Amino acid sequence: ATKVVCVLKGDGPVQGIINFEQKESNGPVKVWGSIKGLTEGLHGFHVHEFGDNTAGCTSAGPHFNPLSRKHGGPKDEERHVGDLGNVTADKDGVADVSIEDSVISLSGDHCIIGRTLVVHEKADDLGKGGNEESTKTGNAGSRLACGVIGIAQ
Amino acid sequence: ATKVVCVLKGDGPVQGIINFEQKESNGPVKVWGSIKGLTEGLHGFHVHEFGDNTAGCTSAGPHFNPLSRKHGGPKDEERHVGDLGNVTADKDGVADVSIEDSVISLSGDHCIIGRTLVVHEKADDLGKGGNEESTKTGNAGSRLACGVIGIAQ
Ligand SMILES: *[Se]c1ccccc1C(=O)NCc1ccccc1
Ligand SMILES: *[Se]c1ccccc1C(=O)NCc1ccccc1
Ligand SMILES: [Zn+2]
Ligand SMILES: [Zn+2]
């Protein structure tokens, strides 16, 4: 009953369309779609705080973290709201995205609408990386593609 | 105290950055920025319903109209929430945008976050055009550039 969408654009082309659906405001969000142009392997996949693409993906700021927590994986209690882990690209450079998440929302204080979805250069270590940056960014590196998260029909 | 931003891009030369700021929860919204690549004259300037850029600006759908009103100009009672009138480009193809609007909002049912800002091919006749489409789209024609409206820092 809430549908939300994001068009990811970045150089490669790294490009993708990610859909979000939430049947009830109390409920999990299904996240699905496709990203192409990626290198094989894991790519960190996050909601960042600002829906600001003024100077590209860097304008989006840090991971969306309304609760002031440390970085983690989506299955961790200690995570940023925006922590959606990794998408995995094959040799064809395509990541088939199929995520269900109970922490992001399409309503309320954890709402992701108007924020930025980013697919990153490297793997997110899901905060298990044992350097300082693991607990902040997951060491997922640069921002390959992003988009502002918008209301869908 | 709330700041929102939109990067306008499309298939041709039209591009811009539009900022929105709302000092008080239900107060007026200041809208300002710059759009270049335009023909001289008026270009319809609207918030459209969907923050969906899947297939370009057409995916944004009709004018944002939560109150089921007819199309009008920003200074009309009978308007869509998304009706921000026209921006005016000079011979250089630059429109300097400076708008204050009391109907849009950055919170609540009138909130434009997650929706799409669109700059159009032609003038919006502000519903005074005396054909049927005047009362729906303002006859502003095709969508030159658009962006999803995002939360800013
Ligand atoms: Se997303 C969010 C955050 C705080 C309070 C309300 C909401 C919400 O209801 N989103 C607005 C919306 C409106 C129409 C379609 C989808 C989303
Ligand atoms: Se205003 C609006 C419209 C659609 C979806 C969500 C929201 C919203 O209010 N989100 C919460 C928000 C907005 C601006 C700054 C911080 C948080
Ligand atoms: Zn994080
Ligand atoms: Zn209208």
Rg of chain A, Å, rounded: 14 Å
Structural class label of chain A = mainly beta
Main beta-sheet annotation of chain A: 5 strands, antiparallel
Spatial strand arrangement across the major sheet of chain A: 6-3-2-1-9
Order of helices and strands of chain A: EEEEEEEEE
CATH topology heading of chain A = Immunoglobulin-like
CATH domain class name of chain A: Mainly Beta
Tell me, briefly, the overall form of chain A.
globular
Largest interface: A-B, 22 and 22 residues
Characterise the protein shown here:
Chains A, B: One of its GO terms (molecular function) is identical protein binding. The structure is a homodimer of 153-residue chains. With 153 residues, chain A is mainly beta. Chain A has one domain (1-153): Superoxide dismutase, copper/zinc binding domain (Immunoglobulin-like), CATH 2.60.40. In chain A, 0% of the residues lie in helices and 40% in strands. Chain A is built from no helices and nine strands. Chain A has a five-stranded antiparallel sheet, with no helix packed on it. In chain A, strands 5-4-7-8 form a four-stranded antiparallel sheet, with no helix packed on it. In chain A, a hairpin with a 6-residue loop joins strand 2 (14-22) and strand 3. The radius of gyration of chain A is 14 Å and the shape is globular. The interface between A and B is medium-sized, with 22 and 22 residues. The complex binds ~{N}-(phenylmethyl)-2-selanyl-benzamide (2 copies) and zinc ion (2 copies). The site of one ~{N}-(phenylmethyl)-2-selanyl-benzamide (Q7T) has 7 residues of chain A, from loops. One zinc ion (ZN) is lined by residues 46, 63, 71, 80, 82-83 of chain B.
